[PDB]
Each structure stands twice: as C-alpha cells, then as structure tokens.
Design a protein around this ligand. Sequence first.
Ligand SMILES: Nc1ccn([C@H]2C[C@H](O)[C@@H](COP(=O)(O)NP(=O)(O)OP(=O)(O)O)O2)c(=O)n1
Ligand SMILES: [Mg+2]
Ligand SMILES: [Mg+2]
Ligand code: NA
Ligand code: NA
Length: 426
Amino acid sequence: GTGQDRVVALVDMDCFFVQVEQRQNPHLRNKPCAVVQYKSWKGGGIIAVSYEARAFGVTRSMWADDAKKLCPDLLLAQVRESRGKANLTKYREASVEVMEIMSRFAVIERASIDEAYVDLTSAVQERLQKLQGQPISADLLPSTYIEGLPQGPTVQKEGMRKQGLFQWLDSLQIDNLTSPDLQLTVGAVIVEEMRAAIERETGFQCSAGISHNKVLAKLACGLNKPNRQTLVSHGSVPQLFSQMPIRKIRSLGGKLGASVIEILGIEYMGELTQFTESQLQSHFGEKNGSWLYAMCRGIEHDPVKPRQLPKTIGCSKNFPGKTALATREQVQWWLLQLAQELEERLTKDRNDNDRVATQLVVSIRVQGDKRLSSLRRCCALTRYDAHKMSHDAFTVIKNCNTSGIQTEWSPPLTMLFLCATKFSAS
DNA sequence: ATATGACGCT
DNA sequence: AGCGTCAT
Ligand SMILES: Nc1ccn([C@H]2C[C@H](O)[C@@H](COP(=O)(O)NP(=O)(O)OP(=O)(O)O)O2)c(=O)n1
Ligand SMILES: [Mg+2]
Ligand SMILES: [Mg+2]
Ligand code: NA
Ligand code: NA
C-alpha cells in the first residue's frame, strides 16, 4: 500500500523536567535553567535543559560546573534525593497528569516519561462527519507547520508558517472524506485542542508531529520544537527524506543504522529506495529489510499500542569510580535502599492501577565492563516487602562474588538494578 | 564519573 | 531465561 491508512500523532513535552521544576518554582521561568542529578562530583550531571540555556550550548550529560562555564547565569534545579539515590517521582506524577489528559481524546501508547503516540484515525472520522464538508479555517491550526511548505513562485518564521498553512489549506479537497491529506489536517486540528488542554490544565507546553505512522510523527514533532506542531504528509516524504540522515529515524540511531550507511555506502533515507526489498533483507535480515524498504517510502505499520501505564517499575543506581561497592555489607545496604523505593512505588502503583507485579529482576554491573548490565537474574515477587525483596535479590547474586573473604566483594559492583515486572490484574 | 524503560535474539 | 539493542 501507500501507508496512508492511519492518522498518528506523537506529543512530546518541551524540556519536560525543566518545565516541571519551573511550574513549582516561578523564579526559574523564562530563564536559562537546567535540571541536575547529584552535586558533589563536578556540580552534578545535567539531564534537562531549557531552550534559553540550549542557546548557550548547555546540553544533557554535561557536568553542571562545565555548563556554568558556557552559561554563568544558568539556574539549576536538583533532582530529589531519597535513600541516597535520585528519585524521579515528581516527574512520573507530572507525566501521569499529561497522559490522563491525552487519554480523553484517544487511546495512547506511553512511549516515555514525556511522550505518547496517539491513533486519531477514528476521532478524525467522527470530526469529519460532525463537520459537513465545511472548510478548515487556518484559525483552527494556530501553531501548525506544514512540512515542505511554502513552496513555489516574508522573512519572519511566523509569516512563513502562515504562508505554508495557507498553501496547504487552499489545495485541500474536502469533498473526499477519504483524502489522506484531509485526514491528517483534521488530526492536526484535534492535536491543537489536545495541546491546548495540556497547557491549560497543567501549565506545561509541548510539541507534536502528525503523520500516517509513528516514525514520521516522531520525526515531524522535532522539526519545529518548542511549542509547535508539524504535519508531515505522505507527499512531503520524498523531499524530506532526500537529505535526512539515516540516524535521525527512530530505531536507526545505533548499530543497525550505522551498518546501513556502512554496507550500502549511503547517507540519506531517500537513497534506500534504489534497493530491492530482497537486497535489504539480505544485508539486514528479513524483518529489518522489509521495514527499511517500506520506511524509506514513508510506510510503516507499527501500531499505536493501547498502553497508558509502564509495564515495569525499576530502581537503579550506578557506583562509578572509587564508590564501587567492595564489601558485602555495602551491597546489602544499597539493595535495601533500592528495595525500599521499589516497595513504595509498587504499593502506590497497586492502589492507583489495580495491579500487582509478580516477578523481581535483579541486575548488576561489575567494575570494568562497559555493558549496561553484567548479569540479570529473576525470582518471585510474592509480597511488597522491601526487606524480603532485598534479601532475595542478594540470594540470586551472591555467587557472583569471587572473593575468598566473604565479608568483601570482588569484583566491585558498579551498578545495582531492581525491576518489578509481570503484572497481573488485582 | 554521560536513571530508567520497551523490545529483539536465542 | 539471560543477554543485546535502542531509546528518553
Ligand atoms: N537521555 C535522556 C533524555 C531525557 N531525559 C529526561 C529528561 C527530559 O526532560 C525528559 C524527556 O526527554 P526528551 O523529550 O528527550 N527531552 P526534553 O523533553 O527535556 O526536551 P525536548 O527536546 O523534548 O523539548 O526525559 C533523561 O533523563 N535522559
Ligand atoms: Mg520532550
Ligand atoms: Mg521525549
Ligand atoms: Na487511581
Ligand atoms: Na530518543
């Protein structure tokens, strides 16, 4: 097919953790500010950056002391620390605020703490029927960009936006209820309403992409951040993809996308069209090969999954450098700190969402291993009891200690991770 | 010494 | 089941 069957939107909050802190603390609003984790080592690690601070070159992962060199007036909000660890509860609860608003408009797939996909196909059909072929006024799309427009025969971005939108709407054929471009346009009208409700009811601004599938919706979202939304039509794909680096497409940002560029000797998504589906399958596998063949034409069939809640609840802490855990008592104490946070999050989850986790995953990283995880083990999660969860976690990992002195722990542990999974309705 | 969470591979 | 990949 032509991959125009659905209307799919991705809504992503703008500098989300910063907005959460700026709502709470109005003295941070409209200023270069960032959210920082910990403090002692180089001022802490930055994990979110306001757009005023991005202009100075402040970025994620940057040390706060280094960010202050680029932006001396940078304001910092620190992530909460509980039981010796970062605690992200404030941001999870703000995320729930947003997701429950989005859910009023259509079923959502929670894709991260700050973004969800929406399938608007049904909602579009209903608005199209409630409207009666009445044209769509530009006033209904006050923050929408039409990628690829304006085009053809002034110098301010808002003026450009309106010129593109006018061109788009002037060419739209509303007599055809099945026109994909009309469907996208109605989808964008709905997303305007959804974004307005989010801002009114939470104070948070967001951006969105509207297209026919997840990949295009995600790409569109980022094209005019912040506080704007972008419609990427099927027709816009050839020009858009002709200069689009492969690594910008969701799932091609790692080794697979590197192999595509390396093996095929290309750089842009549109260059993939010159290969047969079998060719791509030969290099990258049947699944990936078929996916790439469709995707480079703007076609992708990954459905918006109805999932509003995370399906796992985890707690993790790294122990870098000299802080690596080297004694049994140290491992036990931190496993308990993690287990205690997990217990309170699990208890809250059960009351909120009428479900219980049944499996506990335990993962550690050993000193020197660059892998995210060095070993993973599981056991039953029978009761929401921190001491039992930490005791069981130690049982399943205690043989990894290659030390003739049992009071010590070698090799030193550089990460502990506890994750509750396999939820069942309760 | 750049805390999570979903899904793929075997 | 346990590890690998990619994401935010
Ligand atoms: N690698 C990352 C990316 C994001 N996050 C957190 C902080 C972000 O505010 C929040 C949302 O991630 P994000 O959407 O990728 N970036 P953010 O919303 O901060 O700025 P935008 O570029 O979306 O406007 O997740 C993180 O902790 N580690
Ligand atoms: Mg965001
Ligand atoms: Mg995001
Ligand atoms: Na509830
Ligand atoms: Na990402």
